[PDB]
Amino acid sequence: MPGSLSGIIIYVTVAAVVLIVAVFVCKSLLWKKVLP
Amino acid sequence: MPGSLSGIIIYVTVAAVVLIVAVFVCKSLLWKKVLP
Amino acid sequence: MPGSLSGIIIYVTVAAVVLIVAVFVCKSLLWKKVLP
C-alpha cells in the first residue's frame, strides 16, 4: 500500500554531502565583512 | 555463493551520517563542565 | 541506451566518505616533513 522507503535510502546520500558544504556557506557569509 | 552485496551498499550511506555527529558528541564530553 | 543513472547514485555515497578522510591525509603530508 505505502511503497516509498526506496526514496528515503537515496535521500540520506544527498543530505550527507549538503550537511558538510552548509558549514562553509554559513561562515563564508559572516566573514564577508558585510553587516545586514 | 551466499552473496551479501545488498548489505554494504545500504550501510556505507548510514556510516557517513553517524561519523559527523559522533566526533561533535566526543568533544562535548572533553569541553564539559570538568576538563583535564 | 537510456545512459546509466545507476552509476552516479552509487558514486555520490563513496565520494562523501573519501572527502572526510582526504583532508587528514593532506594535513599529515605537511606535518610528516617536521616530527614533534
Q: How far is A13 from chain B (nearest CA, A)?
A: 6
Q: Which of A5, A6, A8, A9 to mutate to test the interface with B (most CBs of B within 10 A)?
A: A9
Counting beta carbons within 10 angstroms of the beta carbon of residue B16, is it exposed (0 to 12), middle (13 to 18) or buried (19 or more)? buried
Please report which helix (H) or strand (E) contains residue C20, including its range. helix C5-31
Cell numbers of C25, please?
Answer: 591525509
Q: How many residues appear in chain C?
A: 36
Grid look-up 570538568 returns B34
Query: What φ, ψ does residue A30 adopt, rounded to 5°?
Result: -80, -30
What domain count does chain C have?
1
Neighbours of C13 (CB within 10 A): 20
Counting beta carbons within 10 angstroms of the beta carbon of residue C16, is it exposed (0 to 12), middle (13 to 18) or buried (19 or more)? buried
- Interchain CB contact of B12 with C (< 8 Å): yes
How far apart CA C10 and CA C7 sit, in angstroms, is 6
Question: Is the separation of the CB atoms in B14 and A15 below 8 Å?
Answer: no
Say which experimental method was used. Answer: NMR
Question: Is the separation of the CB atoms in B16 and C16 below 8 Å?
Answer: yes
Look up residue C21 and give its amino acid. V
Cell numbers of C11, please?
Answer: 558514486
> Which residues of chain C are within 8 Å of residue A16 when distances are taken between CB atoms?
16
Question: Is the separation of the CB atoms in A9 and B13 below 8 Å?
Answer: yes
Domain residue limits at A18: 1-36
